[PDB]
Amino acid sequence: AKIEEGKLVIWINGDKGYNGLAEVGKKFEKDTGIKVTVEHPDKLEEKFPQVAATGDGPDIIFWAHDRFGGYAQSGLLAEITPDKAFQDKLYPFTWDAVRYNGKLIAYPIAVEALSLIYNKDLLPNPPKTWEEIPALDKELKAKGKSALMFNLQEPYFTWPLIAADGGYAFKYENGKYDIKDVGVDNAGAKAGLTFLVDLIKNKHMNADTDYSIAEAAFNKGETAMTINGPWAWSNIDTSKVNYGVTVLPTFKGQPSKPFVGVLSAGINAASPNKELAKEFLENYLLTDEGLEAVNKDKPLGAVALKSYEEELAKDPRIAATMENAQKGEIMPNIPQMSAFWYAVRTAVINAASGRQTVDEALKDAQTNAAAVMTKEEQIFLLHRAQAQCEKRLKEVLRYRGRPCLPEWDHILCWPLGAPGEVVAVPCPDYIYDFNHKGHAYRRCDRNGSWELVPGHNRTWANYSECVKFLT
């Protein structure tokens, strides 16, 4: 189905409760005469920006919140206008997840985090550490079984291990994310990916394992453990495997750190049905009955709606989900997230198959997750700081009573210097490549002259703190 005035088309991932969502859509049609169609196209999160402009998107797209800053940036999402009374019904932190440049750009639905799912009959006591898995697998392989299978094709599933002992996406520097500070190739990220790679090398896992292979393997009792989200529980219910949902194993003593997603629903900017979409989301879906219809099909996790979450919180599987979430981090929603995920996807696939070493693979991912101010731009910014410096010199211009004079040195404007003192200036904001927490230094001599380099006519200046992160 394609967009038409007076109908709704909804896209949601094929792993979620699309049948349940379809039932909410039919209730809406029964009440209003408005047809609601639910589809689950493959790679819908990649398809959406490619086809919205051409007229082939849906009215409403469901995805975790991390993709939505990119869509908003690209002008593909309508700002949503829920009143304060409606906002009060959902948890504050869920609204935060769907805020982009101070505007709400999606309705939050549910909070998702990966957990360790294990087969109680094969594994009464699941491992508390990643390190004990190899010996557990050797033991299980002897009984014609394996310890663990999970999706290796999507970095979302391997991220909790990469992040456990120090990998991170973007550094959160109070207020906001620093896109120049990526934590994909530090020591902890290498340690975590190396462990994954060694499991494969030692034949405790197969580099080609994907979602459906891991799910079939667990749901047929072939493997003792899997790693998956709440949506996976109803297929395990159908399978009648005796399963539990628990905290992810630790790596090097540190909790596994899942990236936590808020399943959200955005409205297509190209839709002529924005009001109908709002009405369906607020009055049909985001109700106890609406969410229960979906949850009954495939579990949502911990829902944004407080009234229904209060009932779901009682489920020990939801408790485990929340414990794992609490140990993880809510994903950024910034436009850069898709570049990050593509880079980490490539790294893990490449390292797992031996195409690259862990070192080669993560170095490249760092380069790509962080890959713009031009030189021409930078030159203008310097010219601006220079003019600002000259305007400053206009107005400005016994023992240790004569200061060094302010000057421009082609990078920084130096202020008045007290004679005999070191003068510190913050590494300037307008230099993109600088370390902005650092200082540059000059020395003002006792006579009020800036200190010169011995054997030369140049002024002594130390910019080593500024260029700290340029190797």
Binding site: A371, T374, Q378, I379, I411, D433, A461, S464, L470
Partner: peptide, 22 residues
């Protein structure tokens, strides 16, 4: 990689080399 980073960073390296005298 990206050529704009290369040009920008090379430009800055050149400028720094003259001025940073420590």
């Amino acid at each position: 990689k990206s050529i704009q980073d290369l040009r920008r960073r090379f430009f800055l390296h050149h400028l720094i080399a003259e001025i940073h005298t420590a």
